[PDB]
Design a protein around this ligand. Sequence first.
Ligand SMILES: [Cl-]
Ligand SMILES: [Cl-]
Ligand SMILES: [Cl-]
Ligand code: NA
Length: 129
Amino acid sequence: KVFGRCELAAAMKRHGLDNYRGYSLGNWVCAAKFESNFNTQATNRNTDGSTDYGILQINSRWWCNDGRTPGSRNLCNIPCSALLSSDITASVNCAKKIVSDGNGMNAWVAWRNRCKGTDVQAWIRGCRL
Ligand SMILES: [Cl-]
Ligand SMILES: [Cl-]
Ligand SMILES: [Cl-]
Ligand code: NA
């Protein structure tokens, strides 16, 4: 599923991401835009052999099991394929564990390089929330 901007904002707010660990909703929408272009089915392979999955590009070396990343830790206790669903619940629940890990949203390289320090409220402007 490819979300619309406001549709994704509303879904993330319903799943408790707005101001989660102090990160306003615009931060999460911005991260999803540049990680996946709002596409729940996005996958990308990393140089170390791990793969990133879903709307927030969660990595198989630490967070989910894809059966082909040796020595991976599966900290969200899910198959990585569950992160590609049109239902974003699994991605949101795992993202909450990632952002609580000590480094905040800096875990998402696209957020650090393209969202951090910008006017992220622009990403929810006009939305009925
Ligand atoms: Cl915001
Ligand atoms: Cl990740
Ligand atoms: Cl933080
Ligand atoms: Na893993």
